[PDB]
Design a protein around this ligand. Structure first.
Ligand SMILES: Nc1nc2c(ncn2[C@@H]2O[C@H](COP(=O)(O)OP(=O)(O)O)[C@@H](O)[C@H]2O)c(=O)[nH]1
Lengths: 177, 179
């Protein structure tokens, strides 16, 4: 059976751990958001093809630039994530995450993922960004960033509502098959 | 309520961590040293490079740290002190991280399918690479849990702060030791 190693990277609090929990348990963890997601494996069916999908979190390593790349060797596909309501996390796709991922893994496909989709039209969120002379990241900004870093897909999702969530991981597998 | 959830996760994930290291030692390592099978000459007698000091790290959490964290179960606002007390022991993680690239490089170049074969025969969901990354993950996770406790503990923030300071220094020192 084809085995796939998928590593999830991106700024703190873009929702890496939530994304992974919400996907693997089929529900947002509302009552308490866990800090720890242990390395995960599971058989999944995609387009009539059986595959074993492995998922590794990286939360907690964001400040240690020489410890992070210990997870990168033999990765088959990367999800580089940013929050759609954090422009700083979006710019860090270009300033921090793409450069180190591509340096260590020159041939490995990248999927660019925009998280917290449910908040892009949230009144209070928009207002708080406004107070800082910012606005949410919209779809064409995502597309442009993906083209810049050579991502094979750009995808938006919400761990909270699960909108777009299964599609992210289906496409990660399709990038490898 | 939230601090009780955080403490419960600290203890449960600590037990899982001890169990995982135990499994790695008694499968992937025992196969090399048992003298029961056939090891490639490229890795023969090189188990100390492959596994680093993970035996010593396991002994610390199995013999001491999980038992001491358990004693703090009803004292979550004080658990920062556990990390201050045993601060010296966490220096082993510096040695472990430094050696990790050589371990990966040796497995990739000379191990062939030896460890993959071992995984199949034991029906393990986790590869040897999946197990060997776990100390790197664990030593960078404790600071996240201590930060969470700081968001919901009135008394005593002091104890937590000192513990957090320790668990930021350890992974920073390990990071700075990488070539
Ligand atoms: N509204 C909304 N909030 C989210 C979503 N995903 C995560 N969050 C929140 O964002 C914060 C960070 O999530 P987490 O998974 O811990 O991020 P990580 O540090 O990158 O692992 C948490 O407080 C979550 O409640 C989402 O899809 N929608």
């Amino acid at each position: 059976m084809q085995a796939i190693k998928c590593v999830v990277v991106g700024d703190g609090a873009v929702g890496k751990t939530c994304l992974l929990i919400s996907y693997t348990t089929n529900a947002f963890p509302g009552e308490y958001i866990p800090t720890v997601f242990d390395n995960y494996s599971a058989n999944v069916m995609v387009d009539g093809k059986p595959v074993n999908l492995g998922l590794w979190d990286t939360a907690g390593q964001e400040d240690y630039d020489r410890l992070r790349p210990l997870s990168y060797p033999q990765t088959d596909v990367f999800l580089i994530c940013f929050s759609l309501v954090s422009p700083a996390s979006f710019e860090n796709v270009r300033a921090k995450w793409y450069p180190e991922v591509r340096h260590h893994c020159p041939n490995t496909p990248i999927i660019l993922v925009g998280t917290k989709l449910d908040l892009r039209d949230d009144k209070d969120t928009i207002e708080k960004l406004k107070e800082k002379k910012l606005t949410p990241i919209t779809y064409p900004q995502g597309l442009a960033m993906a083209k810049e870093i050579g991502a094979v897909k750009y995808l938006e999702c919400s761990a909270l509502t699960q909108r777009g969530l299964k599609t992210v991981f289906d496409e990660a597998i399709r990038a490898v098959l | 309520r939230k601090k009780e959830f955080i403490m419960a996760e600290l203890l449960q994930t600590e037990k899982a961590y001890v169990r995982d290291l135990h499994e790695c030692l008694e499968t992937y390592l025992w196969e090399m040293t048992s003298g029961v099978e056939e090891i490639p000459p490229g890795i023969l007698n090189k188990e100390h490079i492959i596994f680093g000091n993970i035996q010593e790290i396991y002994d610390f959490h199995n013999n001491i740290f999980l038992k001491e964290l358990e004693k703090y179960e009803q004292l979550p606002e004080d658990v920062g002190h556990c990390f201050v007390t045993w601060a010296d022991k966490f220096q082993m993680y510096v040695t472990y991280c430094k050696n990790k690239p050589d371990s990966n490089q040796l497995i990739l170049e000379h191990a062939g399918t030896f460890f993959d074969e071992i995984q199949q025969r034991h029906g393990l969901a986790n590869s040897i690479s999946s197990y060997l990354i776990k100390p790197v993950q664990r030593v960078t996770k404790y600071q996240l849990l201590l930060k969470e406790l700081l968001t919901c503990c009135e008394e005593g923030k002091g104890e937590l702060k000192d513990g957090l300071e320790v668990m930021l220094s350890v992974p920073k020192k390990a990071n700075d030791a990488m070539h």
